Amino acid sequence: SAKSFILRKKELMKRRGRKVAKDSKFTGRKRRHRF
Amino acid sequence: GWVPVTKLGRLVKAGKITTIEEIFLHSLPVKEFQIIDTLLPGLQDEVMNIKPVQKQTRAGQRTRFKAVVVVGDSNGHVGLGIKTAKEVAGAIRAGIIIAKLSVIPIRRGYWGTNLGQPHSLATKTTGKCGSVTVRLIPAPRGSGIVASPAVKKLLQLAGVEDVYTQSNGKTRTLENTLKAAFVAIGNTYGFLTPNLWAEQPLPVSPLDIYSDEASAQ
Amino acid sequence: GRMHSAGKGISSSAIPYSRNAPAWFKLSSESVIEQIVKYARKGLTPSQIGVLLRDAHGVTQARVITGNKIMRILKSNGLAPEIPEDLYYLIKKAVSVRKHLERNRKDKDAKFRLILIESRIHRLARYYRTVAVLPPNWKYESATASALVN
Amino acid sequence: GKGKPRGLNSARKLRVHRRNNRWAENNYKKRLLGTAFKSSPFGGSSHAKGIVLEKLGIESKQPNSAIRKCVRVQLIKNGKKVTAFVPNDGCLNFVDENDEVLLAGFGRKGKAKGDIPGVRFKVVKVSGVSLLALWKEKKEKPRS
Amino acid sequence: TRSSVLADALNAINNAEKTGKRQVLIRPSSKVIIKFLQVMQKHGYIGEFEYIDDHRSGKIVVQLNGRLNKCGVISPRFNVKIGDIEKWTANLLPARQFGYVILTTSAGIMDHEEARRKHVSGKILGFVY
Amino acid sequence: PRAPRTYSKTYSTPKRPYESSRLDAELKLAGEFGLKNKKEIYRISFQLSKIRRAARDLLTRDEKDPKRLFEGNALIRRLVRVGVLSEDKKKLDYVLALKVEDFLERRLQTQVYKLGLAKSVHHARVLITQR
RNA sequence: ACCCACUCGGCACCUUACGAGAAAUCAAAGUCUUUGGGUUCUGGGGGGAGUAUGGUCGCAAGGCUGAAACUUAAAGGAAUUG
RNA sequence: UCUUGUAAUUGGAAUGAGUACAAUGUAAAUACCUUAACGAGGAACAAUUGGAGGGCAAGUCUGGUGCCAGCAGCCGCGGUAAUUCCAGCUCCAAUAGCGUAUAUUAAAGUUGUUGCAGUUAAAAAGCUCGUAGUUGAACUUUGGGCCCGGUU
């Protein structure tokens, strides 16, 4: 539920008036692979 | 195409007043925004916050937009503008209007000896708004402003050069810190020093002597 | 406020701004002294001599007319008592309330007031033996206090 | 006011009151009771070494799962048994039984990090070589 | 009780200046209160003060004039070494120029600038600015 | 048991490492002077902070103090002899007003470029390194 | 006995913010980032836990003093809106 | 008409990493300093370590694998509590260094002397007496005049 959590908290800074990077197909993935 | 609508508007329309120190000297109440635009140019603006707030009714959910903006030209004159309106352009516009209505002058000074074009604040000063205390401490030459980027932007728009900025409380709320900084810089203008101990002439409020072309039509 | 209660009352006496000879007195400077000695030989305490002088003979206060305080005058002629006046009255009060307690053993308020009165007696006796008015130890106890008071 | 004694000759009460209150810390009580040298899985050590006792098929969920497994290991110096999250997938074929792995913490100064409940160690090394080099096909695991 | 009469005097002055009164009554009076107010009056922070003399301990009536931000006591009277005097200022003054912290030395009761000029030190007493 | 050889590091990394204004100013300086990394900027900032701390606690000292006079005159003489501080600014509030690129101007690389002979800053660095 | 005026010491009450506070609200919860009148007691995220053990008081019931191992990213309060 | 960039375009310059006559060096050697001769055209003499919703600087990238009683029908689309299941591209930071673990310090006013808090968020002994300890009203030579000489 990482993608759902990031999308849910992703909308709050729009309500609170802060800039948010626009979403695409890189959100809920391991950006940097582990060891 | 602004027309004079009040006594101060008729005062500034003929150009018989040339400084804002007369307004800030005898505690002149400011009524409109056009006086400071027609009297001082170069008032640069920068939006600080735009947020969607809500009001819940019986049937609908009316969403307002709240605009928080700052105003200051380049030197010692800071205004804060808070507004809730219906559209983003209207909220920004009315926030700039109330920002011009809330302009306060600032007395800067020297951290050390009295040489070379004052840079910093004269006194240790504080301000508070809702469990956020913003403190301002004079700093030496070349120290710069060490503060949060919102407070740093506000103080750079102020025209002050070196400020040490300690803060306390839950500082993550942007509005509380901004209002604390605003009341702090108002406090450091309002502070009384021995340099203000010389006997001023105490003028006779020249609105009395200029009332015969500043009255009603 | 008070030392052993919750009160905060301020009722007292206000000595006037004068230290010399009220104009209506014009009587003497040693007749008042011999009245003090006569009253003390009758069997009175310094405060009672003071109240009798101020209510009967027009002596505003003996500190200004005689030049000395009443207990100093009684010390000069050898009329000083064994134990001082306020300690004597505290001891007499303690003896009376202790007799009332031993007659009525279930009175807890009288027990509490005994504890308060003995605490006051101990603090006063410590003050008196600090400046060496009492004998240097004097060891106040409950029973012999009866034989100490009368 | 302000509760505390303030007189000039009153340093002793300040000292003793501060010592008792400092005994109501969390770090001070953990340090002066010697808690890590007697009770911690490590001996107050930064890393440790252990013998792989078991590996369990711990997935995040059921068959549509995330392959994030952990092994159960027994220490060399203490003898206590702990569990450790191995690195990224593909390293499970490297870690067999009885491999003499070297372990570190997980990142919360002595507490579990991540969505794995109750795992605070990671297998830094296996058989005395690495996991980063062994996963990147740079060095290979020595036999026995 | 009145452990410090100077503290009560400074509190009375501070509250009366905050409220906006012209006169403030101070009771009881003392040598150190008179000297503290004399340092204030010499520096011009307060106006003119006059000592009502009843036989007990006196009262003081202070004519204020505004121009006083805060006066305060420091309790207990810490011993102040001379090389640490400036440190004290940095803890209780807005700037380094205006405002004075007041010391009692064996050369008298004086502000910190006079203590630095005379090369003396002593016990901290309070501050005014 | 040989007597120890004292060493000391001559740079200090910034407390907040990811902020855009400082990063772009550092890249501005590195581009205009031709620097290998950020450690030169850190080194200049470190020694300038040392100079500024010395100037500050001399200016806190009372005037006509012999230590203040001696150390202040030595500091001003040294920073004029280096060539960073100008000839007409021999005061202490003026040495508090120094900046990083004022120090970075007086390098041999920048001075060999500005005196002709190099036609670039990177050509100046390459020309210096090659003896 | 009552009425009017003043004063001392009480139990309280209505409004307000020069002030304070997260807010409800407070003549104290004020005189505090402009931080110091004097002095006792207490707290330091939540569970484990008022638990184990020791000491001590009590005829008993129980009282007083009182942990750690482990575990968790919450827990809590004040108001608005339905 | 003077200033920058791009490129399967092109030209000559320069130097040390190294290979080393020699000489310095050294108790004797190794190395540093100096130097006869050789030593650069890119897969040469090729820099790595971390990371990219926000923290925090940097993606409205690409491909493959696995599931769906969801549409289509063998082309495929969409979803996938696959906490991305696996790789690549692009970008950012530091740079001969960079990452991780543990401890400690700062941010920390979460130890508070400076400098915390205790109605309701943790926390005022049920109440009073009371020993040590901590603290404790005001007052005792102030004022005036004389000279001389020190520092700006």
From Swiss-Prot, chain A:
This is 18S rRNA (guanine(1575)-N(7))-methyltransferase. It comes from Saccharomyces cerevisiae (strain ATCC 204508 / S288c) (Baker's yeast). A motif (Nuclear localization signal) lies at residues 17-24. It is found in: Cytoplasm; Nucleus. Present with 1620 molecules/cell in log phase SD medium. It comes from the Eukaryota. The chain holds residues 241 to 275 of 275 of the full protein. Belongs to the class I-like SAM-binding methyltransferase superfamily. BUD23/WBSCR22 family. Residues 16-35 are annotated as: Disordered. Interacts with TRM112. Interacts with ECM16. S-adenosyl-L-methionine-dependent methyltransferase that specifically methylates the N(7) position of guanine 1575 (m7G1575) in 18S rRNA. Requires the methyltransferase adapter protein TRM112 for full rRNA methyltransferase activity. Important for biogenesis end export of the 40S ribosomal subunit independent on its methyltransferase activity. Required for efficient cleavage of the primary 35S precursor rRNA at site A2. Involved in positioning the proximal bud pole signal.
Curated annotation (Swiss-Prot), chain C:
There is a cross-link at K38, K42 (Glycyl lysine isopeptide (Lys-Gly) (interchain with G-Cter in ubiquitin)). PANTHER family: RIBOSOMAL PROTEIN S15P/S13E, SMALL RIBOSOMAL SUBUNIT PROTEIN US15. One of its GO terms (biological process) is maturation of SSU-rRNA from tricistronic rRNA transcript (SSU-rRNA, 5.8S rRNA, LSU-rRNA). Keywords: Cytoplasm, Isopeptide bond, Phosphoprotein, Ribonucleoprotein, Ribosomal protein, Ubl conjugation. GO terms for molecular function: small ribosomal subunit rRNA binding; structural constituent of ribosome. Component of the ribosome, a large ribonucleoprotein complex responsible for the synthesis of proteins in the cell. The small ribosomal subunit (SSU) binds messenger RNAs (mRNAs) and translates the encoded message by selecting cognate aminoacyl-transfer RNA (tRNA) molecules. The large subunit (LSU) contains the ribosomal catalytic site termed the peptidyl transferase center (PTC), which catalyzes the formation of peptide bonds, thereby polymerizing the amino acids delivered by tRNAs into a polypeptide chain. HAMAP family: Ribosomal_uS15_A. The gene is RPS13. Belongs to the universal ribosomal protein uS15 family. The keyword Ubl conjugation applies. It is found in: Cytoplasm. The keyword Ubl conjugation applies. InterPro entries: Ribosomal_uS15, Ribosomal_uS15_arc_euk, Ribosomal_uS15_N, uS15_NS1_RNA-bd_sf. This is Small ribosomal subunit protein uS15. Pfam families: Ribosomal_S13_N, Ribosomal_S15. CDD domains: Ribosomal_S15p_S13e (cd00353). The modification Phosphoserine is found at S31. It comes from the Eukaryota. Coiled coil: none annotated. One of its GO terms (cellular component) is cytosolic small ribosomal subunit.
UniProtKB/Swiss-Prot annotation, chain D:
The modification 3,4-dihydroxyproline is found at P63. Changing N64A: Lethal mutation. This is Small ribosomal subunit protein uS12A. The gene is RPS23A. Its main location: cytoplasm. Keywords: Cytoplasm, Hydroxylation, Isopeptide bond, Ribonucleoprotein, Ribosomal protein, Ubl conjugation. Changing P63A: Lethal mutation. It is found in: Cytoplasm. GO terms for biological process: maintenance of translational fidelity; maturation of SSU-rRNA from tricistronic rRNA transcript (SSU-rRNA, 5.8S rRNA, LSU-rRNA); regulation of translational fidelity; translation. There is a cross-link at K55 (Glycyl lysine isopeptide (Lys-Gly) (interchain with G-Cter in ubiquitin)). GO terms for cellular component: cytosol; cytosolic small ribosomal subunit; ribosome. Hydroxylation at Pro-63 affects translation termination efficiency. The stereochemistry of the 3,4-dihydroxyproline has not yet been determined.
Swiss-Prot record, chain E:
Its main location: cytoplasm. The lineage of its organism: Eukaryota, Fungi, Dikarya, Ascomycota, Saccharomycotina. The gene is RPS22A. It is found in: Cytoplasm. One of its GO terms (cellular component) is cytosol. The keyword Oxidoreductase does not apply. One of its GO terms (molecular function) is structural constituent of ribosome. This is Small ribosomal subunit protein uS8A. Component of the small ribosomal subunit (SSU). Mature yeast ribosomes consist of a small (40S) and a large (60S) subunit. The 40S small subunit contains 1 molecule of ribosomal RNA (18S rRNA) and 33 different proteins (encoded by 57 genes). The large 60S subunit contains 3 rRNA molecules (25S, 5.8S and 5S rRNA) and 46 different proteins (encoded by 81 genes). It comes from Saccharomyces cerevisiae (strain ATCC 204508 / S288c) (Baker's yeast). Belongs to the universal ribosomal protein uS8 family.
